[PDB]
């Protein structure tokens, strides 16, 4: 690969680079520095490359095309950059040329070929329909792909990728005025979409994820009006009758229930309050560690329950001794027993945890402190098992996330959002320090790799941009340094954080950043020399 080849002023130069380097090299342009994206995605290049792609797509004879894969990938990479990069903007004559190229591939007699090579280029064409804002233009093709899909297509990884792209089109169409005004009249699309979701052969198969996406997008169609409405309702009713919320086809049931509940009247479908019933079905095990920790789980062994409870119990004692809490909670906090809710896998978390706890699941777990002062507030850590999680409990992120419960109840006044000063360095640093103690090679490694942060910088840390090195490793280093070298200062700070005097907390740590920077550097030196 040579990403600089895509920066030439000459469109023919850029075309030749796309052809010679191929899709795996074009990948770099999605993440390239702005100078590269600005040069590669000039309006003139997008137009000229689209015009070349049109002729090549017309000539396509099936069996895949490395060049067409790379060309369509480039075009939709341009729309990706245009969306995110303020210095990439397209003139109005760009998108019609791109639409012409997509048309040429769609109208080619080979468009519905079933093969992995064809799927590689077809995938990029289907995604371009969304990236280029053409969701209103190919609904007959979306319908055809939905009804043509079968077990033969489903054998091929890249055909699964490609046809799964039609759910991206339907989702992205929400922002397309022409799509919004026509989709509700597409009775044949609605029938095909529902019948795709109802295809029993998808359950447990390589394409189950597509059937679940179909159910979710079908439920989303209830936000529109038009002649297709009764078909959408009828197909959703059939989904809710054919499958169930916990059991066979529940990925499809729950996918449809998610968007129906959000955009429609749950009472029209008989699914109001399914989330409370779902919780009892999925989190069917209950294991009380102690008055301060109870586990609800989907499918854990007795040995895992015992190990989770003892590991958390050890952290609990180490926390209370280290933070000198006297086991006295902050005021206005009645989160007396943490509920630890553990699903059987990341996939189960993604399916069931969303509706049960009203959370997003595109993550590795989350702790919901809630409103600690409100009667009936429940503190919920929501998690899953994973094969590469820590023995002997195998609960992902358990040891770190558990400390957030303790810190929130005994150190930090108020709910999660109460602080009016930045406290990420403390929250994440204390979770790392209590859970890992002095075993943290990654924190040693970031001192000696050419990039360090001052105490001043660490205290300003936020979650914006999610700098894991800064948040987790340098938060740990600052916290550990303060406990080892300035414990009385930490106790002074906790007087303020425990009652929500955030301005006082900031003034306290401001003094640390002025006074202690050179000692912090010496303490880092000692850590590095110990490693050697």
């Amino acid at each position: 690969c040579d990403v600089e080849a895509f920066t030439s002023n000459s469109s023919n130069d850029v075309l030749n680079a796309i052809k010679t380097q191929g899709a795996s090299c074009v990948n770099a342009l999605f993440s390239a520095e702005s100078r590269i994206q600005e040069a590669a995605f000039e309006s003139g290049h997008m137009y000229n490359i689209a015009k070349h792609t049109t002729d090549l797509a017309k000539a396509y004879a099936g069996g895949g095309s490395d060049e067409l894969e790379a060309l369509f990938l480039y075009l939709r990479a341009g729309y990706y950059a245009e969306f995110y990069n303020s210095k990439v903007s397209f003139l109005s004559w760009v998108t019609p040329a791109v639409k012409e190229a997509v048309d040429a591939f769609v109208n080619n007699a080979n468009f519905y070929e079933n093969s992995d090579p064809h799927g590689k280029v077809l995938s990029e064409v289907i995604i371009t329909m969304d990236s280029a804002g053409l969701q209103h233009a190919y609904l007959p093709q979306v319908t055809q792909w939905l009804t043509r899909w079968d077990s033969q297509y489903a054998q091929n990884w890249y055909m699964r990728n490609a046809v799964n792209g039609v759910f991206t089109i339907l989702f992205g169409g929400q922002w397309n005025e022409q799509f919004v005004q026509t989709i509700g009249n597409q009775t044949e699309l609605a029938k095909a979409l529902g019948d795709f979701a109802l295809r029993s052969s998808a359950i447990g198969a390589s394409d189950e994820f597509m059937a679940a996406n179909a159910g979710r997008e079908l439920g989303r169609l209830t936000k529109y009006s038009g002649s297709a409405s009764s078909t959408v309702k009828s197909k959703l009713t059939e989904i809710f009758a054919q499958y169930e919320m916990y059991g066979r086809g529940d990925a499809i049931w729950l996918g449809a229930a998610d968007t129906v509940s959000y955009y429609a009247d749950c009472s029209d479908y008989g699914i109001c309050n399914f989330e409370s019933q779902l919780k009892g079905l999925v989190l069917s095990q209950s294991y009380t560690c102690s008055p301060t920790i109870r586990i609800l789980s989907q499918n854990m062994t007795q040995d895992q329950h015992v190990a989770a409870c003892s590991k958390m119990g050890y952290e609990e004692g180490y926390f209370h001794t280290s933070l000198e809490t006297g086991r006295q909670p902050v005021a206005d906090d009645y989160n007396t027993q943490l509920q630890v809710n553990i699903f059987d896998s990341s996939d189960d978390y993604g399916k069931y945890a969303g509706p049960i706890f009203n959370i997003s699941t595109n993550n590795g777990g989350m702790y919901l402190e809630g409103d600690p002062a409100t009667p009936g507030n429940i503190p919920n850590f929501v998690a899953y098992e994973a094969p590469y999680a820590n023995p002997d409990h195998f609960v992902w992120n358990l040891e770190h996330e558990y400390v957030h419960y303790l810190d929130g109840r005994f150190d930090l006044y108020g709910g999660f959002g109460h602080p009016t000063e930045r406290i990420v360095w403390w929250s994440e640093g204390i979770a790392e320090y209590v859970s890992k103690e002095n075993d943290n090679q990654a924190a040693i490694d970031t001192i000696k790799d050419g990039s360090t942060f001052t105490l001043s910088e660490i205290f300003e840390t936020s979650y914006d941009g999610f700098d894991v090195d800064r948040i987790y490793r340098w938060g740990y280093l600052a916290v550990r340094f303060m406990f080892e070298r300035h414990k009385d200062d930490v106790n002074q700070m906790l007087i303020e954080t425990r009652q929500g005097n955030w301005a006082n907390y900031k003034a306290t740590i401001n003094q640390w950043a002025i006074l202690y920077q050179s000692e912090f550097e010496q303490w880092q030196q000692a850590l590095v020399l110990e490693h050697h």
Partner: peptide, 14 residues
């Protein structure tokens, strides 16, 4: 919110 064919298991907490 459509899922891709591959999702990541070992994510940081939210």
């Amino acid at each position: 919110e459509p899922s891709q064919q591959v999702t990541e298991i070992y994510q940081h907490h939210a």
